[PDB]
Design a protein around this ligand. Sequence first.
Ligand SMILES: [Zn+2]
Ligand SMILES: [Zn+2]
Ligand SMILES: [Zn+2]
Length: 400
Amino acid sequence: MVVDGDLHIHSHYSKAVSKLMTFPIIAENAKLKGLNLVGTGDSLNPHWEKELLKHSKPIDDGTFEVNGVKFILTCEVEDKRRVHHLLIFPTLSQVREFREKVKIYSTNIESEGRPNLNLTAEEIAEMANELDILIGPAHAFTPWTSLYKEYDSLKDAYGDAKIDFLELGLSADSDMADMIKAHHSIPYLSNSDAHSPNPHRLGREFNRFEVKDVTFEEIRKAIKGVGGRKIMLNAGLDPRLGKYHLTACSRCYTKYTLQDAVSLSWKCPKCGGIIKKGVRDRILELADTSEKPKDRPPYVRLAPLAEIIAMVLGKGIESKAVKLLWNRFLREFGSEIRVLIDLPIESIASVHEGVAKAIWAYRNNKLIIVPGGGGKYGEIRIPEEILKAKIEDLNSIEIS
Ligand SMILES: [Zn+2]
Ligand SMILES: [Zn+2]
Ligand SMILES: [Zn+2]
């Protein structure tokens, strides 16, 4: 059994999160996206737990169903140093035991979706280890509220406590994270951190699990790669297009190497602007290996379907032309993820040849990329040889 899962989102109780992030609306857009499993998010908030039990039917003590969509208990907390950690709970009693354990170190457990805990990373992880709650750093390489912004290693942050996974985040893929050897024994999660239920936010990154059933316990087995269960692949954004991938000036966006920026005292000599340290160079600072684990699942670089369509059509993402073609793909094929990953290119071409070539370029890493940096997103382009080629000859075309 193959299931696609997104284990980090936020509810309407979180700051700067859309009010449309309710359980019914999240469930409907998950069906459009192709997510069979979604993390609840904000599970430490008692009002969000109320809405879950009101809107869901029990599968087991840790799995819930809302309109044909399975949910497991997840939450994100912020520690002393503003570092974010992702928690996955086996049962609701573990949610409550953890809630009472950290309540004296927080003042916003009942008023906010992401509680602020006056605790170190090790103290949070040891409480999670004590209650069999899966823990790992959220979006570990993001330039804010993340592990590697405040620490130079997992050990410095968690000490003697154990973590069960690492979340890559929107600014990193698996090959980037595998340049630090301490990560080679830690499974990777790719989650969207969705602040709105729309299919170009919900499921922007997701995991494909091979399980026997969609239960928390089966997902725990898949994360730990035991008993035939495993993560088949991680899917998410191309990190080279990220706002802060390369070290670059924040005004003119000229790219600089790391050692040039430090010798320049972080001042751009072209326009006098402030150079911002890039995520790729942050990992290069810490890189201590050239290998990656043999069993590491592949990382699939994707963009949401309506975003690919808006590029191919050269029109806005909310335009009528993009919505109609996106509706047509979802009508012919049940979900967006099926079109993005599973459909043959020839079948995608039956609806739109240009969208088919674009998706083929994504799957085969044939797109031409101008990397992002300094606050400006990267650029994408389909090479000329692909646009002129027949669909059947795409694998035979020599590129560049
Ligand atoms: Zn976060
Ligand atoms: Zn978050
Ligand atoms: Zn500049």
